[PDB]
Coordinates of C-alpha atoms and ligand atoms in Angstrom, one line a residue:
Chain A
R9 CA 88.0 -29.4 32.2
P10 CA 91.7 -29.6 32.9
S11 CA 94.5 -29.9 30.3
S12 CA 96.2 -33.2 29.5
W13 CA 99.2 -34.0 27.2
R14 CA 98.3 -35.4 23.9
Chain B
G1 CA 95.3 -57.8 9.9
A2 CA 94.5 -55.5 6.9
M3 CA 97.9 -53.9 7.1
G4 CA 99.7 -57.2 7.2
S5 CA 100.6 -57.1 3.5
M6 CA 102.2 -53.6 3.7
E7 CA 105.9 -53.0 4.4
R8 CA 106.7 -51.5 7.8
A9 CA 108.5 -48.5 6.2
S10 CA 105.5 -47.8 3.9
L11 CA 103.2 -47.9 6.9
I12 CA 105.3 -45.3 8.8
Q13 CA 105.6 -43.2 5.7
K14 CA 101.8 -43.3 5.2
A15 CA 101.2 -42.5 8.9
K16 CA 103.2 -39.3 8.4
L17 CA 101.2 -38.5 5.3
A18 CA 97.9 -39.2 7.1
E19 CA 98.9 -36.8 9.8
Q20 CA 99.6 -34.1 7.3
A21 CA 96.2 -34.7 5.7
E22 CA 94.5 -34.7 9.2
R23 CA 93.3 -38.2 8.5
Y24 CA 93.7 -39.5 12.0
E25 CA 91.7 -42.8 11.7
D26 CA 94.0 -43.7 8.8
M27 CA 97.0 -42.7 10.8
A28 CA 96.0 -44.9 13.6
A29 CA 95.3 -47.9 11.4
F30 CA 98.7 -47.5 9.7
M31 CA 100.5 -47.2 13.2
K32 CA 98.5 -50.3 14.4
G33 CA 99.9 -52.1 11.4
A34 CA 103.4 -50.9 12.1
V35 CA 103.2 -52.1 15.8
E36 CA 102.0 -55.5 14.7
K37 CA 105.1 -56.1 12.7
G38 CA 106.7 -56.8 16.1
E39 CA 109.8 -54.5 15.9
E40 CA 110.7 -51.5 18.1
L41 CA 109.0 -48.2 17.7
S42 CA 111.5 -45.3 17.7
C43 CA 110.9 -42.1 19.7
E44 CA 109.4 -40.5 16.6
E45 CA 107.2 -43.6 15.9
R46 CA 105.9 -43.7 19.4
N47 CA 104.9 -40.1 19.1
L48 CA 103.1 -41.0 15.8
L49 CA 101.2 -43.8 17.5
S50 CA 100.2 -41.5 20.4
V51 CA 99.2 -38.6 18.1
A52 CA 97.0 -40.9 16.0
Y53 CA 95.0 -42.5 18.7
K54 CA 94.8 -39.4 20.9
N55 CA 93.1 -37.6 18.0
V56 CA 90.8 -40.6 17.3
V57 CA 89.7 -41.0 20.9
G58 CA 89.6 -37.3 21.4
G59 CA 86.9 -36.9 18.8
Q60 CA 85.0 -39.8 20.4
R61 CA 85.3 -38.4 23.9
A62 CA 84.1 -35.0 22.8
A63 CA 81.1 -36.6 21.1
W64 CA 80.4 -38.8 24.1
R65 CA 80.4 -35.7 26.4
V66 CA 77.9 -33.8 24.2
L67 CA 75.5 -36.8 24.0
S68 CA 75.8 -37.6 27.8
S69 CA 74.9 -34.0 28.6
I70 CA 71.9 -34.2 26.3
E71 CA 71.0 -37.5 27.9
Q72 CA 71.3 -36.2 31.4
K73 CA 69.2 -33.2 30.5
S74 CA 66.4 -35.5 29.3
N75 CA 66.2 -37.1 32.8
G83 CA 62.3 -42.2 23.5
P84 CA 65.4 -44.4 23.5
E85 CA 67.3 -42.6 20.8
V86 CA 69.6 -40.4 22.8
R87 CA 70.7 -43.3 25.0
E88 CA 71.0 -45.6 22.0
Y89 CA 73.3 -43.1 20.1
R90 CA 75.4 -42.4 23.3
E91 CA 75.8 -46.2 23.7
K92 CA 76.9 -46.4 20.0
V93 CA 79.6 -43.8 20.5
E94 CA 80.6 -45.3 23.8
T95 CA 81.0 -48.7 22.4
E96 CA 83.2 -47.4 19.6
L97 CA 85.3 -45.5 22.1
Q98 CA 85.7 -48.6 24.3
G99 CA 86.8 -50.5 21.2
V100 CA 89.5 -48.0 20.3
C101 CA 90.8 -48.1 23.9
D102 CA 90.7 -51.9 23.9
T103 CA 92.7 -51.9 20.7
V104 CA 95.4 -49.6 22.1
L105 CA 95.6 -51.5 25.4
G106 CA 95.9 -54.7 23.3
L107 CA 98.9 -53.4 21.4
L108 CA 100.5 -52.3 24.7
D109 CA 100.0 -55.7 26.3
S110 CA 100.8 -57.7 23.1
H111 CA 103.7 -56.8 23.1
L112 CA 104.9 -53.2 23.2
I113 CA 105.5 -53.0 27.0
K114 CA 107.3 -56.3 27.5
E115 CA 109.5 -55.7 24.5
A116 CA 110.3 -52.1 25.7
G117 CA 113.9 -52.6 26.5
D118 CA 114.8 -49.3 28.2
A119 CA 113.2 -46.7 30.5
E120 CA 112.4 -44.2 27.8
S121 CA 110.3 -46.6 25.9
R122 CA 108.7 -48.4 28.8
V123 CA 107.7 -45.2 30.5
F124 CA 106.1 -44.0 27.3
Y125 CA 104.0 -47.1 26.9
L126 CA 103.0 -47.3 30.6
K127 CA 101.8 -43.7 30.4
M128 CA 99.7 -44.7 27.4
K129 CA 98.3 -47.6 29.3
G130 CA 97.2 -45.2 32.1
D131 CA 95.7 -42.8 29.6
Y132 CA 93.6 -45.4 27.8
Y133 CA 92.4 -47.0 31.0
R134 CA 91.5 -43.4 32.1
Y135 CA 89.4 -43.0 29.0
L136 CA 87.6 -46.2 29.8
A137 CA 87.0 -45.0 33.3
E138 CA 85.4 -41.8 32.1
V139 CA 82.5 -43.8 30.5
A140 CA 82.5 -46.7 33.0
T141 CA 79.9 -47.2 35.8
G142 CA 79.7 -49.0 39.0
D143 CA 82.1 -51.9 39.9
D144 CA 83.6 -52.2 36.5
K145 CA 84.6 -48.6 37.1
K146 CA 86.5 -49.4 40.3
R147 CA 88.7 -52.1 38.6
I148 CA 89.4 -49.8 35.7
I149 CA 90.4 -46.9 37.9
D150 CA 92.9 -49.2 39.7
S151 CA 94.4 -50.4 36.4
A152 CA 94.9 -46.8 35.4
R153 CA 96.5 -45.8 38.7
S154 CA 98.7 -48.9 38.7
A155 CA 100.1 -48.2 35.2
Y156 CA 100.6 -44.5 35.9
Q157 CA 102.4 -45.2 39.2
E158 CA 104.8 -47.7 37.7
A159 CA 105.6 -45.2 35.0
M160 CA 106.2 -42.5 37.6
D161 CA 108.5 -44.8 39.6
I162 CA 110.7 -45.6 36.5
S163 CA 110.7 -42.0 35.3
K164 CA 111.8 -40.6 38.6
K165 CA 114.7 -43.1 38.7
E166 CA 115.8 -42.9 35.0
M167 CA 114.8 -39.5 33.5
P168 CA 115.5 -35.9 34.5
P169 CA 112.6 -33.9 35.9
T170 CA 112.4 -31.8 32.7
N171 CA 112.1 -34.8 30.4
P172 CA 108.9 -34.1 28.3
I173 CA 107.6 -37.6 28.6
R174 CA 108.1 -37.5 32.4
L175 CA 106.3 -34.2 32.5
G176 CA 103.4 -35.3 30.3
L177 CA 103.0 -38.4 32.4
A178 CA 102.8 -36.4 35.6
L179 CA 100.4 -33.9 34.0
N180 CA 98.0 -36.8 33.0
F181 CA 98.4 -38.7 36.3
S182 CA 97.4 -35.4 38.1
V183 CA 94.4 -35.1 35.9
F184 CA 93.5 -38.7 36.7
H185 CA 93.7 -37.9 40.4
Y186 CA 91.5 -34.8 40.1
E187 CA 88.9 -36.0 37.5
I188 CA 88.7 -39.8 37.9
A189 CA 89.9 -40.7 41.4
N190 CA 88.2 -37.9 43.4
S191 CA 91.7 -37.0 44.9
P192 CA 92.1 -33.3 44.1
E193 CA 94.7 -32.9 46.8
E194 CA 96.8 -35.6 45.2
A195 CA 96.3 -33.8 41.9
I196 CA 97.5 -30.5 43.3
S197 CA 100.4 -32.0 45.1
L198 CA 101.6 -33.8 42.0
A199 CA 101.2 -30.9 39.6
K200 CA 103.0 -28.6 42.0
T201 CA 106.0 -30.8 42.8
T202 CA 106.4 -31.6 39.1
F203 CA 106.3 -28.0 38.1
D204 CA 108.7 -26.8 40.8
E205 CA 111.2 -29.6 40.1
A206 CA 111.1 -28.9 36.4
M207 CA 111.7 -25.2 36.9
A208 CA 114.7 -25.9 39.2
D209 CA 116.2 -28.1 36.4
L210 CA 115.7 -25.7 33.4
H211 CA 119.2 -24.2 33.9
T212 CA 120.7 -27.5 32.6
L213 CA 118.9 -27.3 29.2
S214 CA 119.6 -26.0 25.8
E215 CA 117.2 -23.4 24.2
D216 CA 115.4 -26.2 22.3
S217 CA 115.0 -28.6 25.3
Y218 CA 113.9 -25.5 27.4
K219 CA 111.1 -24.9 24.9
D220 CA 110.0 -28.6 25.0
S221 CA 109.9 -28.6 28.8
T222 CA 108.2 -25.2 29.3
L223 CA 105.4 -26.2 26.9
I224 CA 104.2 -28.9 29.3
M225 CA 105.0 -26.7 32.4
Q226 CA 102.4 -24.3 30.9
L227 CA 99.8 -27.0 31.1
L228 CA 100.7 -27.9 34.7
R229 CA 100.3 -24.1 35.5
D230 CA 96.9 -23.9 33.8
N231 CA 95.6 -26.8 35.9
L232 CA 97.0 -25.5 39.2
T233 CA 95.4 -22.1 38.4
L234 CA 92.0 -23.9 37.8
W235 CA 92.4 -26.0 41.0
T236 CA 93.8 -23.6 43.7
Chain C
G1 CA 70.9 -51.2 4.3
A2 CA 72.2 -51.1 7.8
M3 CA 69.7 -48.4 8.8
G4 CA 66.7 -50.3 7.3
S5 CA 65.6 -51.5 10.7
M6 CA 65.5 -48.0 12.3
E7 CA 62.4 -45.8 12.3
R8 CA 62.6 -42.8 10.0
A9 CA 61.8 -40.4 12.9
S10 CA 64.6 -42.0 15.0
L11 CA 67.1 -41.6 12.1
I12 CA 66.3 -37.9 11.8
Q13 CA 66.5 -37.4 15.5
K14 CA 69.9 -39.2 15.5
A15 CA 71.2 -37.1 12.5
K16 CA 70.5 -34.0 14.6
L17 CA 72.3 -35.5 17.6
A18 CA 75.3 -36.5 15.4
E19 CA 75.5 -32.9 14.1
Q20 CA 75.6 -31.6 17.7
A21 CA 78.4 -34.1 18.4
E22 CA 80.3 -33.2 15.2
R23 CA 80.0 -36.8 14.1
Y24 CA 79.4 -36.1 10.4
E25 CA 80.0 -39.7 9.1
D26 CA 77.3 -40.9 11.5
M27 CA 75.1 -38.0 10.5
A28 CA 75.4 -38.9 6.8
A29 CA 74.7 -42.6 7.4
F30 CA 71.6 -41.6 9.4
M31 CA 70.4 -39.3 6.6
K32 CA 71.1 -41.9 3.9
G33 CA 68.9 -44.3 5.9
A34 CA 66.2 -41.6 6.1
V35 CA 66.3 -41.0 2.4
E36 CA 66.0 -44.7 1.6
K37 CA 62.7 -44.9 3.5
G38 CA 61.3 -43.4 0.3
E39 CA 59.3 -40.4 1.7
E40 CA 59.8 -36.6 1.2
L41 CA 62.6 -34.8 2.9
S42 CA 61.4 -31.5 4.4
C43 CA 63.4 -28.3 4.1
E44 CA 65.1 -29.0 7.4
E45 CA 65.8 -32.6 6.5
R46 CA 67.3 -31.5 3.1
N47 CA 69.6 -29.2 4.9
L48 CA 70.6 -32.0 7.3
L49 CA 71.5 -34.2 4.3
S50 CA 73.5 -31.5 2.7
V51 CA 75.3 -30.6 5.9
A52 CA 76.2 -34.2 6.6
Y53 CA 77.7 -35.0 3.2
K54 CA 79.3 -31.6 2.8
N55 CA 81.3 -32.1 6.0
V56 CA 82.2 -35.7 5.0
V57 CA 83.4 -34.9 1.5
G58 CA 85.0 -31.7 2.7
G59 CA 87.4 -33.5 4.9
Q60 CA 88.2 -35.9 2.1
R61 CA 88.7 -33.1 -0.4
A62 CA 91.1 -31.3 2.0
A63 CA 93.1 -34.5 2.5
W64 CA 93.2 -35.1 -1.2
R65 CA 94.5 -31.6 -1.9
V66 CA 97.3 -32.1 0.7
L67 CA 98.3 -35.5 -0.8
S68 CA 98.1 -34.3 -4.4
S69 CA 100.4 -31.4 -3.6
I70 CA 102.9 -33.7 -2.0
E71 CA 102.6 -36.0 -4.9
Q72 CA 103.2 -33.2 -7.4
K73 CA 106.2 -32.0 -5.4
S74 CA 107.8 -35.5 -5.7
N75 CA 107.6 -35.3 -9.5
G83 CA 108.4 -45.0 -3.9
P84 CA 104.8 -45.7 -4.7
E85 CA 103.4 -44.7 -1.2
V86 CA 102.3 -41.1 -1.9
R87 CA 100.4 -42.1 -5.0
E88 CA 99.0 -45.2 -3.3
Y89 CA 97.6 -43.2 -0.3
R90 CA 96.3 -40.4 -2.6
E91 CA 94.5 -43.0 -4.6
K92 CA 93.0 -44.5 -1.4
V93 CA 91.6 -41.1 -0.3
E94 CA 90.5 -40.4 -3.9
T95 CA 88.6 -43.7 -4.1
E96 CA 86.9 -43.1 -0.8
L97 CA 85.9 -39.6 -2.0
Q98 CA 84.5 -41.0 -5.3
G99 CA 82.5 -43.5 -3.3
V100 CA 80.9 -40.8 -1.2
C101 CA 80.0 -38.8 -4.3
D102 CA 78.6 -41.9 -6.0
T103 CA 76.5 -42.6 -2.9
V104 CA 75.0 -39.1 -2.9
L105 CA 74.4 -39.1 -6.7
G106 CA 72.7 -42.5 -6.2
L107 CA 70.3 -41.1 -3.6
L108 CA 69.5 -38.2 -5.9
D109 CA 68.9 -40.4 -8.9
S110 CA 67.0 -43.1 -6.9
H111 CA 64.7 -41.3 -6.3
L112 CA 65.0 -37.9 -4.6
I113 CA 64.9 -35.9 -7.8
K114 CA 62.1 -37.6 -9.6
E115 CA 59.9 -37.5 -6.5
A116 CA 60.7 -33.8 -5.8
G117 CA 57.2 -32.5 -6.4
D118 CA 57.8 -28.8 -6.3
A119 CA 60.5 -26.2 -7.4
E120 CA 61.9 -25.7 -3.9
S121 CA 62.8 -29.3 -3.5
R122 CA 63.8 -30.0 -7.1
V123 CA 66.2 -27.1 -7.2
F124 CA 67.8 -28.2 -3.9
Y125 CA 68.5 -31.7 -5.2
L126 CA 69.7 -30.5 -8.7
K127 CA 72.2 -28.2 -7.0
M128 CA 73.4 -31.1 -5.0
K129 CA 73.8 -33.1 -8.2
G130 CA 75.9 -30.4 -9.6
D131 CA 78.0 -30.2 -6.4
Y132 CA 78.8 -33.9 -6.2
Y133 CA 79.7 -34.1 -9.9
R134 CA 81.9 -31.1 -9.4
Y135 CA 83.7 -32.9 -6.6
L136 CA 84.2 -35.9 -8.9
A137 CA 85.5 -33.5 -11.6
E138 CA 88.1 -32.1 -9.2
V139 CA 89.9 -35.5 -9.0
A140 CA 89.0 -36.8 -12.5
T141 CA 91.5 -36.9 -15.4
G142 CA 91.2 -37.0 -19.2
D143 CA 88.1 -38.0 -21.0
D144 CA 86.2 -39.2 -18.0
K145 CA 86.7 -35.7 -16.8
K146 CA 85.0 -34.2 -19.8
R147 CA 81.8 -36.2 -19.3
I148 CA 81.7 -35.5 -15.6
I149 CA 82.1 -31.7 -16.2
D150 CA 79.2 -31.8 -18.6
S151 CA 77.0 -33.7 -16.1
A152 CA 77.8 -31.0 -13.5
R153 CA 77.0 -28.1 -15.8
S154 CA 73.8 -29.8 -17.0
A155 CA 72.5 -30.3 -13.4
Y156 CA 73.5 -26.8 -12.4
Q157 CA 71.9 -25.2 -15.5
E158 CA 68.6 -27.0 -15.0
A159 CA 68.5 -25.9 -11.4
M160 CA 69.2 -22.3 -12.5
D161 CA 66.4 -22.4 -15.1
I162 CA 63.8 -23.5 -12.5
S163 CA 65.1 -21.2 -9.7
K164 CA 64.9 -18.2 -12.0
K165 CA 61.3 -19.0 -12.9
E166 CA 60.0 -20.1 -9.4
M167 CA 62.1 -18.4 -6.7
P168 CA 62.9 -14.8 -5.9
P169 CA 66.4 -13.6 -6.5
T170 CA 67.1 -13.5 -2.7
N171 CA 66.1 -17.1 -2.0
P172 CA 69.1 -18.6 -0.2
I173 CA 69.0 -21.9 -2.1
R174 CA 68.9 -19.9 -5.4
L175 CA 71.8 -17.8 -4.2
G176 CA 73.9 -20.8 -3.0
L177 CA 73.2 -22.6 -6.3
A178 CA 74.5 -19.5 -8.2
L179 CA 77.5 -19.2 -6.0
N180 CA 78.5 -22.8 -6.5
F181 CA 77.8 -22.8 -10.3
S182 CA 80.0 -19.7 -10.5
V183 CA 82.8 -21.6 -8.7
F184 CA 82.3 -24.5 -11.1
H185 CA 82.8 -22.1 -14.0
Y186 CA 86.0 -20.6 -12.6
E187 CA 87.6 -23.6 -11.1
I188 CA 86.4 -26.6 -13.2
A189 CA 85.3 -25.3 -16.6
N190 CA 88.1 -22.8 -17.2
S191 CA 85.4 -20.1 -17.8
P192 CA 86.4 -17.3 -15.4
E193 CA 84.4 -14.8 -17.4
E194 CA 81.2 -16.8 -17.0
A195 CA 82.0 -17.1 -13.3
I196 CA 82.4 -13.4 -12.9
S197 CA 79.3 -12.6 -14.9
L198 CA 77.2 -15.1 -12.9
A199 CA 78.4 -13.9 -9.5
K200 CA 77.9 -10.3 -10.4
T201 CA 74.4 -10.6 -11.8
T202 CA 73.3 -12.8 -8.9
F203 CA 74.7 -10.3 -6.3
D204 CA 73.2 -7.3 -8.0
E205 CA 69.8 -8.8 -8.4
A206 CA 69.7 -10.0 -4.8
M207 CA 70.7 -6.5 -3.6
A208 CA 67.9 -5.0 -5.6
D209 CA 65.4 -7.4 -3.9
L210 CA 66.5 -6.9 -0.3
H211 CA 63.9 -4.2 0.3
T212 CA 61.2 -6.9 0.1
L213 CA 62.6 -9.0 3.0
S214 CA 62.1 -9.2 6.8
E215 CA 65.1 -8.7 9.1
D216 CA 65.5 -12.5 9.3
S217 CA 65.3 -13.2 5.6
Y218 CA 67.6 -10.2 5.0
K219 CA 70.2 -11.9 7.2
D220 CA 69.8 -15.2 5.3
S221 CA 70.3 -13.6 1.9
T222 CA 73.2 -11.2 2.9
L223 CA 75.1 -14.2 4.3
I224 CA 75.4 -15.8 0.8
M225 CA 75.8 -12.3 -0.8
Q226 CA 79.0 -12.0 1.3
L227 CA 80.4 -15.1 -0.3
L228 CA 79.6 -13.8 -3.8
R229 CA 81.4 -10.6 -2.9
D230 CA 84.5 -12.5 -1.6
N231 CA 84.8 -14.4 -4.9
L232 CA 84.3 -11.3 -7.1
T233 CA 87.0 -9.6 -5.0
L234 CA 89.3 -12.5 -5.7
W235 CA 88.5 -12.7 -9.4
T236 CA 88.4 -9.0 -10.5
Chain D
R9 CA 90.5 -21.1 -3.4
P10 CA 87.0 -19.5 -3.8
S11 CA 84.1 -19.9 -1.4
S12 CA 81.2 -22.2 -2.0
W13 CA 77.9 -22.7 -0.1
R14 CA 77.9 -25.7 2.1
Ligands
0AW1 N1 104.8 -36.5 13.8 C1 104.7 -35.9 15.1 N2 103.6 -35.3 15.5 C2 105.9 -35.8 16.0 C3 107.2 -36.3 15.6 C4 108.1 -36.1 16.8 C5 109.6 -36.5 16.7 C6 110.2 -36.3 15.5 C7 111.6 -36.7 15.3 C8 112.2 -37.3 16.4 C9 111.5 -37.5 17.6 C10 110.2 -37.1 17.7 C11 107.4 -35.5 17.9 C12 108.0 -35.1 19.2 N3 107.9 -33.7 19.4 C13 106.7 -33.1 19.9 O1 105.8 -33.8 20.2 C14 106.6 -31.6 20.1 C15 107.8 -30.8 20.2 C16 107.7 -29.4 20.3 C17 106.4 -28.9 20.3 C18 105.2 -29.6 20.2 C19 105.4 -31.0 20.1 C20 104.0 -28.8 20.3 C21 104.5 -27.4 20.2 O2 106.0 -27.4 20.5 S1 105.9 -35.2 17.5
0AW2 N1 115.5 -36.9 25.9 C1 114.8 -36.0 25.4 N2 114.6 -34.8 26.2 C2 114.3 -36.1 24.0 C3 115.0 -36.9 23.1 C4 114.3 -36.8 21.8 C5 114.7 -37.6 20.5 C6 115.0 -38.9 20.6 C7 115.4 -39.6 19.4 C8 115.6 -38.9 18.2 C9 115.3 -37.6 18.2 C10 114.8 -36.9 19.3 C11 113.1 -36.0 21.9 C12 112.2 -35.7 20.8 N3 111.1 -34.9 21.4 C13 110.0 -35.6 21.9 O1 109.9 -36.8 21.8 C14 108.9 -34.9 22.6 C15 107.8 -35.6 23.1 C16 106.8 -34.9 23.7 C17 106.9 -33.5 23.9 C18 108.0 -32.8 23.4 C19 109.0 -33.5 22.7 C20 107.8 -31.3 23.7 C21 106.4 -31.2 24.2 O2 105.9 -32.6 24.5 S1 113.0 -35.3 23.4
0AW3 N1 96.8 -26.1 47.7 C1 98.0 -25.4 47.3 N2 99.1 -26.0 47.3 C2 98.0 -24.0 47.1 C3 97.4 -23.0 47.9 C4 97.6 -21.6 47.4 C5 97.1 -20.4 48.1 C6 97.4 -20.3 49.4 C7 97.0 -19.2 50.2 C8 96.2 -18.2 49.5 C9 96.0 -18.3 48.2 C10 96.4 -19.4 47.4 C11 98.5 -21.7 46.2 C12 98.9 -20.5 45.4 N3 99.1 -20.9 44.0 C13 100.4 -21.4 43.7 O1 101.2 -21.4 44.5 C14 100.9 -21.9 42.3 C15 102.1 -22.3 42.5 C16 102.9 -22.9 41.6 C17 102.4 -22.9 40.3 C18 101.2 -22.5 40.0 C19 100.3 -21.9 41.0 C20 101.1 -22.7 38.5 C21 102.4 -23.2 38.1 O2 103.2 -23.5 39.2 S1 98.9 -23.2 45.9
0AW4 N1 70.5 -28.6 11.3 C1 71.0 -27.6 10.4 N2 72.2 -27.4 10.2 C2 70.0 -26.7 9.7 C3 68.6 -26.8 9.9 C4 67.9 -25.7 9.1 C5 66.4 -25.6 9.1 C6 65.8 -25.7 10.4 C7 64.4 -25.6 10.5 C8 63.7 -25.3 9.3 C9 64.3 -25.2 8.1 C10 65.7 -25.3 8.0 C11 68.9 -25.0 8.3 C12 68.6 -23.9 7.3 N3 69.3 -22.7 7.8 C13 70.7 -22.4 7.5 O1 71.3 -23.2 6.9 C14 71.3 -21.2 8.1 C15 70.6 -20.1 8.4 C16 71.2 -18.9 8.9 C17 72.6 -19.0 9.0 C18 73.4 -20.1 8.6 C19 72.7 -21.2 8.2 C20 74.8 -19.8 8.9 C21 74.9 -18.5 9.6 O2 73.6 -17.9 9.5 S1 70.4 -25.6 8.6
0AW5 N1 61.7 -19.5 1.3 C1 62.6 -19.2 2.1 N2 63.4 -18.0 2.0 C2 62.9 -20.1 3.2 C3 61.9 -21.0 3.8 C4 62.5 -21.8 4.9 C5 61.7 -22.8 5.7 C6 60.9 -23.7 5.1 C7 60.1 -24.6 5.8 C8 60.2 -24.6 7.2 C9 60.9 -23.6 7.9 C10 61.7 -22.7 7.1 C11 63.9 -21.4 5.1 C12 64.7 -22.1 6.2 N3 66.1 -21.6 5.8 C13 66.9 -22.3 4.9 O1 66.5 -23.4 4.4 C14 68.2 -21.8 4.5 C15 69.0 -22.6 3.7 C16 70.3 -22.1 3.4 C17 70.8 -20.9 3.9 C18 70.0 -20.2 4.7 C19 68.7 -20.6 5.1 C20 70.7 -18.9 5.1 C21 72.1 -19.1 4.6 O2 72.0 -20.3 3.7 S1 64.3 -20.3 4.0
0AW6 N1 85.1 -8.0 -14.9 C1 84.2 -7.2 -14.2 N2 83.0 -7.3 -14.3 C2 84.7 -6.1 -13.3 C3 85.7 -5.2 -13.7 C4 86.0 -4.3 -12.6 C5 87.0 -3.1 -12.7 C6 86.9 -2.3 -13.8 C7 87.8 -1.3 -14.0 C8 88.8 -1.0 -13.0 C9 88.9 -1.8 -11.9 C10 88.0 -2.9 -11.7 C11 85.1 -4.5 -11.5 C12 85.0 -3.7 -10.2 N3 84.6 -4.6 -9.1 C13 83.2 -4.7 -8.9 O1 82.4 -4.1 -9.6 C14 82.4 -5.5 -7.8 C15 81.1 -5.3 -8.1 C16 80.1 -5.9 -7.4 C17 80.4 -6.7 -6.4 C18 81.7 -6.9 -6.0 C19 82.8 -6.4 -6.8 C20 81.5 -7.8 -4.9 C21 80.1 -7.9 -4.5 O2 79.4 -7.3 -5.6 S1 84.1 -5.8 -11.8
CL7 CL1 72.3 -45.6 17.3
CL8 CL1 97.3 -46.8 1.0

């Protein structure tokens, strides 16, 4: 899965 | 609300303690209470709100994915029942966050910095609803995420530099939305690439500290492009 | 109870799903429901109960330690208040586990394997109460932990081999009790050392798989002795 | 802190 900003 | 009797300052103080203790459900409840006081959230306080709910919903999403995989493999009622339980809890958290944004964080966000932050959050929590949604409800939810993300993008491009970390994190997440939710991998690649390139071309304007802020999110854009191309 | 309407088998199935999903509060609630059906817990099911509550109380203990350290450093009411909140929640979990043991897991535990397991748990959850207790309440709690641990030790030495993993984990935890709770580091060292040596001398009787079970806990005995001597 | 069995 791709990275998101959290 | 259960936090209605606690001072705003005490809620913010306890949110910060809960973060240190890795008590993210407490952290989110304290930040919900702070929002409901009806005053501005500062940059720090917006980050506290985002950290709290991202950790809460992150645990739920990870659990949901595990259960959904087990459910799909098995295709009694127990797996479906327990997946539905986690799903309902996840939807409730997203509804709560969206409710805080709509009543009344967004309308009271009196500058671009704050409005972009909240509109990014609106896109994120509609995205998490879309992940578990099915059918026609899914289509309306997807459109609500895209719309919130797009409005944030429009404002951020007008009012923030291309290295601003909120702008970068918004673009990162909208790109993930395109790839994972909207079946628009080309849009995802185009967005991540333009965002990365335009940030790189602006790094020369930054201090050492702002440089570190921006390159941290640039790393994540690079990791996705490496996965996608 | 909220799990009263669910089949025992479904509760056990969902406890195992919750473990896979790292949903330990759910896991513990499902296992509480299973216990309250009033039938035996199997070896596997006892391990599920122990895993669930150890993870729940572990998160609480870690949070409590963080807050207590911050509180001690600062010596407004907020730090104390929030530490007390976590402490009360921790005590409630320990009370719940102790209530399941006393009503009626222990009295219905009709062999040594099961009775030792539950008496070890009784010692553990009194130990966690002792960690946060103060003053004279603390003294009675410490005695209740020691008494439960000692009775488990007496039975385990009579009825289990010295490599049995429940016997080893019991001795490990009683040794920690002695060192950390009872201010009896010599007792702690003596217990960990005899337990380790007597397990090592019995390894020759074991299969490859039982050998791995026993040496895993022996590792923890070694790590403590290395810290203490 | 010392190790316990969990
Ligand atoms: N209590 C929190 N979690 C936060 C508080 C603030 C804050 C504090 C004071 C003023 C304005 C904002 C945050 C904003 N800064 C970051 O998010 C951040 C910066 C660099 C960095 C990483 C994250 C990951 C690795 O490198 S986060
Ligand atoms: N205009 C800017 N460039 C910033 C201004 C402030 C600020 C505002 C008021 C008070 C103190 C500081 C920032 C604080 N830092 C963040 O909020 C932040 C958020 C997400 C993130 C990172 C940093 C790094 C990785 O992801 S950044
Ligand atoms: N569909 C696209 N646009 C791409 C197609 C190709 C390609 C074309 C011909 C042969 C092999 C590959 C690309 C090469 N990969 C990158 O250029 C890349 C660029 C910038 C960047 C990162 C990765 C990470 C951070 O910033 S990109
Ligand atoms: N659902 C759970 N968690 C468990 C289920 C069972 C079980 C299953 C079937 C029959 C009887 C018991 C457990 C007992 N086995 C261990 O605890 C154990 C064994 C080896 C080992 C480790 C732990 C750590 C690394 O090496 S644990
Ligand atoms: N008599 C024994 N030696 C055992 C008998 C059984 C059993 C009983 C009924 C059904 C299936 C298996 C065991 C299962 N294994 C554990 O319960 C266990 C618990 C804690 C632990 C480890 C293992 C390794 C590290 O810490 S062990
Ligand atoms: N107070 C005690 N009993 C000890 C005193 C000393 C000592 C004495 C003189 C000089 C230096 C040290 C000990 C040495 N350390 C061990 O023997 C040891 C033994 C078995 C074992 C582990 C460690 C881990 C797993 O199993 S032990
Ligand atoms: Cl369920
Ligand atoms: Cl509190």
